[PDB]
A = this chain, B = another copy of it.
Amino acid sequence: SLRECELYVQKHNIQALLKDSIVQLCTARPERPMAFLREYFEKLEKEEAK
């Protein structure tokens, strides 16, 4: 029952967020992961305009 529900959050929903996520945690040096996610997309959101 919980598997079919996860069919939406595959590589099309949280992927755009997890993509850069691991790219930063790959170094395994999260001085603060609890707050990292907060400032992670907070600043990444205002990435200027192409």
Q: Which residues of A are at the interface with B, using a C-beta cutoff of 8 A? A: 2, 5-6, 8-9, 13-14, 16-18, 21-22, 25-26, 28, 30, 33-35, 37-38, 40-42, 45
Contact = CB atoms under 8 A, between A and B. Distances in A.
Oligomer copy total: 2
A39 to B, nearest CB: 8
A42 to B, nearest CB: 5
Contacts of A22: 6, 9, 14
Q: Is the interface of A mostly helix, strand, loop or mixed?
A: helix
Contacts of A26: 2, 5-6, 8-9
Contact of A25 (B9, B30, B35, B40): B9
26 contacts: A2-B26, A5-B26, A6-B26, A8-B25, A8-B28, A9-B21, A9-B22, A9-B25, A9-B26, A9-B28, A13-B28, A13-B30, A14-B18, A14-B22, A14-B25, A16-B33, A17-B33, A34-B41, A34-B45, A35-B41, A35-B45, A37-B40, A37-B41, A38-B38, A38-B42, A38-B45
